[PDB]
Design a binder for this molecule. Structure first.
Ligand code: SHI
Ligand code: SHI
Lengths: 258, 258
């Protein structure tokens, strides 16, 4: 009956505590989703174990094997009972797993090294000196791969065939690439992560332009899971009580470093 | 099998066409939700009839009779098969009807007559010369009635006992009150409606401060309805294809009058 929670090491949702090596179990972790997990478990009356997704991915269906990877896969194949992470609600995922209503609203955005002469996706698409990419799997990459909108289709055509690869394995790698590329690399990632990093030292990045879309993160469970109903009601209650807003402030701005 | 759609006359979601008196059926109406209804019906393969909610309300449980009114009530009592309108996803409603994932994101906001010395909810709560209210039923009024947050609790205590009443029957009445009160009345309504009105003549209102919360509108169906699954997938597809963003631009800004 201990609920197995799959999540991902993504700041500031789930991070290793500074003294994690001296701790064990759930206590090794801290962050927005660690706090959210505790709140959801309290309101739903369950005990849980936090586990970091084995392959470190969000979740996508492998085009060759048709097998789902990441957190989505752990739910699909019964390795975890629930996913509490910044997992984007998308059509392809909705078809295979259940999602609570959004606990956070967001959109794809552009991260640049301060001073980079870019203000929008259109700007990126109309030039070649500044390379740009996305996480190598997940909703952002899929957004571009499937887009039929002129600007985005043009961006995908460039990104997919760009060499060396413009895609990264983790958000942290994308941020590092922006910071080390002297303005010659821009990273496409969710506004939530972008806004967080903008308030972290060395305070050398900036979110520019409006978001490309409007979507949300949902707490996921295996399709048909009896846990889904209570979890969804918990998310709505937590949002209405102002807890979710308090948590974003706690992990994004209260201790901002810039 | 013709699907009965309940909706509400709320600009720019559903409005009477200028020549409505010479037309009949669905063709009498136009707006964001009229377009959305057509798209959803197309993707789900159903024919429908648009009907305007009899009591003109969004939906709340009468504390005396325990009977649900508005669009929520029409779904609860089987008078309509689906609601396609700016119906806010809330905990109390989620418990009695089904909701698709959000088709629009929004939050409670403040509408003022241009020049009014108010920039936030806190400002409103710390003064008495400028009266303020909400729709007389629905998620915004409930937000304040149930709030345990200092500023909002203080605002509710004032609003509920204010005489004459600071509540209005329709969004249009709230807007008119702001426009005719010479800056002595501020209206609390959803950002979506606020942003729309700001671009309508006489261009004398303004949205001020940040939103008080973050939530969304969902397409609703009776609890357990077989129509829910397809409708939800349709909303996600329409959002991912960029249609929803196109529709907001079409009805909010493309023909803005300011
Ligand atoms: N939340 C996204 C992944 C993601 C995180 O930040 N930018 C991204 O692209 C997903 O669920 O794939
Ligand atoms: N969408 C809300 C009503 C509403 C519309 O605009 N401001 C409001 O308060 C609801 O569903 O009650």
């Amino acid at each position: 009956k201990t609920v197995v929670v799959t999540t991902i090491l993504e700041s500031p949702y789930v991070m290793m505590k500074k003294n994690h090596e001296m701790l064990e179990g759930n206590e090794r972790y801290e962050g927005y989703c660690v706090d959210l997990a505790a709140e959801i478990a309290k309101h739903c009356g369950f005990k849980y174990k936090l586990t970091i997704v084995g392959d470190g991915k969000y979740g996508a269906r492998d085009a060759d094997t048709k097998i789902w990877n990441g957190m989505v896969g752990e739910l699909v194949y019964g390795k975890a009972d629930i996913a509490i992470a910044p997992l984007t609600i998308t059509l392809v995922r909705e078809e295979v797993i259940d999602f609570s209503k959004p606990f956070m609203s967001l959109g794809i955005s552009i991260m640049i090294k301060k001073g980079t002469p870019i203000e929008s996706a259109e700007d990126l698409s109309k030039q070649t000196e500044i390379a740009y990419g996305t996480l190598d799997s997940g909703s952002t990459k899929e957004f571009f791969r499937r887009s039929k909108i002129a600007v985005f289709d043009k961006m995908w055509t460039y990104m997919r065939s760009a060499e060396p690869s413009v895609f990264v394995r983790t958000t942290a790698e994308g941020v590092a690439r922006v910071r080390k590329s002297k303005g010659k690399y821009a990273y496409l990632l969710e506004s939530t992560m972008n806004e967080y990093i903008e308030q972290r030292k060395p305070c050398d990045t900036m979110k520019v332009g409006g978001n490309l879309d409007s979507k949300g993160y949902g707490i996921a469970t295996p399709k048909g899971s009896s846990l889904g109903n209570a979890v969804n009601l918990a998310v709505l209650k937590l949002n209405e009580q102002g807890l979710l807003d308090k948590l974003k402030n706690k992990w994004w701005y209260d201790k901002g470093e810039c």
